[PDB]
Design a protein around this ligand. Structure first.
Ligand SMILES: *[C@@H]1O[C@H](CO)[C@@H](O)[C@H](O)[C@H]1NC(C)=O
Ligand SMILES: *[C@@H]1O[C@H](CO)[C@@H](O)[C@H](O)[C@H]1NC(C)=O
Ligand SMILES: *[C@@H]1O[C@H](CO)[C@@H](O)[C@H](O)[C@H]1NC(C)=O
Ligand SMILES: *[C@@H]1O[C@H](CO)[C@@H](O)[C@H](O)[C@H]1NC(C)=O
Ligand SMILES: *[C@@H]1O[C@H](CO)[C@@H](O)[C@H](O)[C@H]1NC(C)=O
Lengths: 409, 218, 208
């Protein structure tokens, strides 16, 4: 179980490409965007867009491929009709079923067309082991009696994966609040050690533009399966501790405690994750990490810590593997202002322990989704790295299986 | 429209100081990333420095790292560039460029591209003393002579801007001694010679020479 | 750190297509931008983010990026397209933006122009300063490459000339200065500037 706990120089990480084990990831002459990779217990869920446009939402098993290396094996694929309307899927597993919450819009991405968005959501329940001649079991679109959002005007899932606590599901989500109704005292903006900042920066940066109609607040969507035959979804806003713009977040189980991660799309370049103190209301004990950040743009580049007016960043999450020392793993982009050079990194709060470069220093790489698990009492991690192929001129996901070494030699 | 107005260029010893200012009009100056792109005479452009919209992040090039310092005054809508320990290589036209991208995106495949450019400001790092020109008239088409000056540039205008049509100012020639000389000319009809008074307004900053020379037939 | 390589010059016939190569190590993973710079003018942007064209830029300007080379293809080349072109990129390996060496695009088949030559004698104020100078200004001539010949009373002389510089109008322009002593201007009773362009000579005379 125990891993290498100290900073070392030897290339102990030996990532293995398992992309062709998942045959849908790899196709010739096709652009594949908006990926989702979610795992829990023994199964997983996956989604992408073949932009003959097609949306694919599938589930399967994480099994030993043979040489004691895990790989994803698909057990059920769903092709939802009208792929132009389906946006921002989020996946949670519970009791031999996978629940995929997803938004429906006829005005494009609701993030970019916030005012015109219909607000309609849809929830589909996929079976991990589908029955032949199985209606209402293989895949079945559930009915939501109501969507409780409070003072927020609209809510929407905004993240790859979530957790289940007993009989209740918790999707990562975000709340659309009218900016006029947003209550904020600009004195809370940490412009103390930032002489080029202003009090109104992080308040105006709660929307994609300073003059934005809405503001984005990350949080959770709650689905209690034991709440009548037709349960409802309730929104749970994240606390004001280290508040940032509503970004694609992720909540996952790790060693018997849920962990929360929020993407850095604002000025808070440093990674925003940590153990969850309370699920309802949401309170995340953020790490005080000072070594992992994400590539942004010109005004909010990597490692920026000063409140600025910006909406720049990329989604690179981490997975806690040793809570005692708080050692996490994730594929991050070694770049300041471009989405380039993905590196699998194992790090503590103030020290990068060991790393391994997945590609070349100038390889286009955007989204990264990392989940870790055990395989015969050994700690493995499967990461999904959006990578641009040099030849096909089309971005594409890639699946890497990295084992966390036990020794440091 | 949008326009960048550089200033502050000139003529300086090696190892001296020089500060250029860039006046910006036509856009929200605080919302954009400004940069300094310099271009040697008759060569390609080179990026000197850059500064974020709020001025929190400053980016320099390795050629001028430790010697140049970029700053910004968003209240005055102006961009600065403090040049110290100047080398003879730094002699170039200095442009002022604004980031041309507009929109709400998360990542840019090209985070740095310029639109528009200014009109440049001439900076000459040299150890040669400046020389004042001599303004002589070309009597009648009619013109003005600008003999034996250093360094570039000098400006000439006929009738204080009230006469731009048909005024073809020719480029300067570098004489064997290293002192420049040029002449501008404007073609006028012979039906308004003894009435319209023609004066060329020559101006040469580095030696503080400003001359208005009237051109009449001999 | 990063290196952009551009061919020094490109020549295309009018109406055809002109393709400007911009070479770079794995340049496909990078956003290439294009800047056009006509003589005496600031560089104007004609293509950004590989293929996007700015507002007001003619649609015949298109950029493409794939592999180790991005090519700016100028379709239906016009006479005004004669300018210097630079490709530009951002090197995230050193946080620099990098330019190319440039490409001077000359358009073929433009008709020949006549040198508008005018000769001015030394000014009265200048002549009083015991120093004299004669000026000969050739304006608007294509192709840009001429020869100057200074004569004294029909006799050749042994004078500074400038390099032919392209003007706003695509025809070139240049000037030449003849410096003499105060006696020489009035000793000989005539002075003429002789300039030849494509086997045809133009002249202009001045008298004290
Ligand atoms: C938003 O949706 C409306 C409704 O059709 C449409 O007119 C508008 O163009 C859309 N804007 C964007 C940016 O998608
Ligand atoms: C904001 O906080 C400051 C400092 O605590 C306080 O002086 C000010 O009154 C607050 N503003 C409001 C509207 O409560
Ligand atoms: C789910 O609902 C049941 C009955 O409605 C209730 O007993 C249980 O506490 C609920 N769980 C959560 C997490 O809300
Ligand atoms: C980070 O530091 C703050 C302030 O000292 C503290 O409240 C918080 O608990 C720290 N986070 C940890 C220890 O995960
Ligand atoms: C990225 O930024 C850090 C500090 O902001 C700097 O040390 C590093 O050199 C930058 N990267 C490059 C490639 O210059």
């Amino acid at each position: 179980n125990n891993i290498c706990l100290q900073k070392t120089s030897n290339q102990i990480l030996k990532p293995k490409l398992i992309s062709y084990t998942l045959p849908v990831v790899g196709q010739s002459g096709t652009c594949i965007t908006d990926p989702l990779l979610a795992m829990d217990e023994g199964y997983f869920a996956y989604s992408h867009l073949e932009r003959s446009k097609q949306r694919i939402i599938g589930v399967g098993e994480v099994l030993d491929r043979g040489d004691e290396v895990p790989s994803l094996f698909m057990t059920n694929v769903w092709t939802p009709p009208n792929p132009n309307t389906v946006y921002h899927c989020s996946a949670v597993y519970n009791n031999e079923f996978y629940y995929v919450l997803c938004a429906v819009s006829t005005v494009g991405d609701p993030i970019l067309n916030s005012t015109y968005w219909s607000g309609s959501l849809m929830m589909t329940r996929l079976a991990v082991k589908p029955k032949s001649n199985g209606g209402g079991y293989n895949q079945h679109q559930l009915a939501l009696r109501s969507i409780e959002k409070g003072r927020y005007d609209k809510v929407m899932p905004y993240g790859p994966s979530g957790i289940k606590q007993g009989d209740t599901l918790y999707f990562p989500a975000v709340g659309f609040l009218v900016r006029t109704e947003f209550k904020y005292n600009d004195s809370n903006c940490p412009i103390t050690k930032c002489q080029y900042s202003k009090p109104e920066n992080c308040r105006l940066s709660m929307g994609i533009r300073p003059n934005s109609h809405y503001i984005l607040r990350s949080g959770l969507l709650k689905y209690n399966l034991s709440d009548g035959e037709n349960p409802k979804v309730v929104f749970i806003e994240i606390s004001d501790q280290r508040l940032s713009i509503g970004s694609p977040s992720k909540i996952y189980d790790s060693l018997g405690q849920p962990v929360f991660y929020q993407a850095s799309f604002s000025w808070d370049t440093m990674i925003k994750f940590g153990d969850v103190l309370t699920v309802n209301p949401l309170v995340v004990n953020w790490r005080n990490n000072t070594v992992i950040s994400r590539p942004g743009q010109s005004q909010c580049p990597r490692f920026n810590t000063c409140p600025e007016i910006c909406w720049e960043g990329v989604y690179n999450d981490a997975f806690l593997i040793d809570r005692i020392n708080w050692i996490s793993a994730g594929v991050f982009l070694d770049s300041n202002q471009t989405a380039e050079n993905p590196v699998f990194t194992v790090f503590k709060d103030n020290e990068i322990l060991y790393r391994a470069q997945l590609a070349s220093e100038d390889t286009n790489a955007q989204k990264t989704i990392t989940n870790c698990f055990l395989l015969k009492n050994k700690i493995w991690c499967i990461s999904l790295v959006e990578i641009y192929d040099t030849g096909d001129n089309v971005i594409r996901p890639k699946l890497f299986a990295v084992k966390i070494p036990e020794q440091c030699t | 429209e949008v326009q960048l107005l550089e200033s502050g260029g000139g003529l300086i010893q090696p190892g001296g100081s020089l500060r250029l200012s860039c006046a910006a009009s036509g856009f929200t100056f605080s919302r954009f990333t400004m940069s300094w792109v310099r271009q040697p005479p008759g060569k390609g452009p080179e990026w000197v420095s850059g500064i974020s919209g709020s001025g929190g992040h400053t980016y320099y090039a390795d050629s001028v790292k430790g010697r140049f310092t970029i700053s910004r005054d968003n209240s005055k809508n102006t961009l600065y560039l403090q040049m110290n320990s100047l080398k003879a290589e730094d002699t170039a036209v200095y442009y002022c460029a604004k980031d041309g991208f507009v929109g709400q995106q998360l990542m840019r495949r090209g985070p740095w591209w310029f639109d528009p450019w200014g009109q440049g400001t001439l900076v000459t790092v040299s150890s040669a003393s400046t020389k004042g020109p001599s303004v002589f008239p070309l009597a009648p088409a009619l013109g003005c002579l600008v003999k034996d000056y250093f360094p570039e540039p000098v400006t000439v205008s006929w009738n204080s801007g009230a006469l731009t049509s048909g005024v073809h100012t020719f480029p300067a020639v570098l004489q064997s001694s290293g002192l420049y000389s040029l002449s501008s000319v404007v073609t006028v009809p012979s039906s308004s010679l003894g009435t319209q008074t023609y004066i060329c307004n020559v101006n040469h900053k580095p030696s503080n020479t400003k001359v208005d020379k009237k051109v009449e037939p001999k | 750190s990063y290196v952009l390589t551009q061919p020094p010059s490109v020549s295309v016939a009018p109406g055809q297509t002109a393709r400007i190569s911009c070479g770079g190590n794995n340049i496909g993973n990078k956003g290439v931008h294009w800047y056009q710079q006509k003589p005496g003018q600031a560089p104007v942007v004609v293509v950004y983010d590989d293929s996007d064209r700015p507002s007001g830029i003619p649609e015949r300007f298109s950029g493409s990026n794939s592999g180790n080379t991005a090519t700016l293809t100028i379709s239906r080349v016009e006479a005004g397209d004669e300018a210097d072109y630079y490709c530009q990129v951002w090197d995230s390996s050193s946080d620099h933006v990098v330019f190319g060496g440039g490409t001077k695009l000359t358009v073929l088949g433009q008709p020949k122009a006549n040198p508008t030559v005018t000769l001015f004698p030394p000014s009265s104020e200048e002549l009083q300063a015991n120093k004299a100078t004669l000026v000969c200004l050739i304006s608007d001539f294509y192709p840009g490459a001429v020869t100057v010949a200074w004569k004294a009373d029909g006799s050749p002389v042994k004078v500074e000339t400038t390099k032919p510089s392209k003007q706003s109008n695509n025809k070139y322009a240049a000037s030449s200065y003849l410096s003499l002593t105060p006696e020489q201007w009035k000793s000989h009773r005539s002075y003429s500037c002789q300039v030849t362009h494509e086997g045809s000579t133009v002249e202009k005379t001045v008298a004290p």
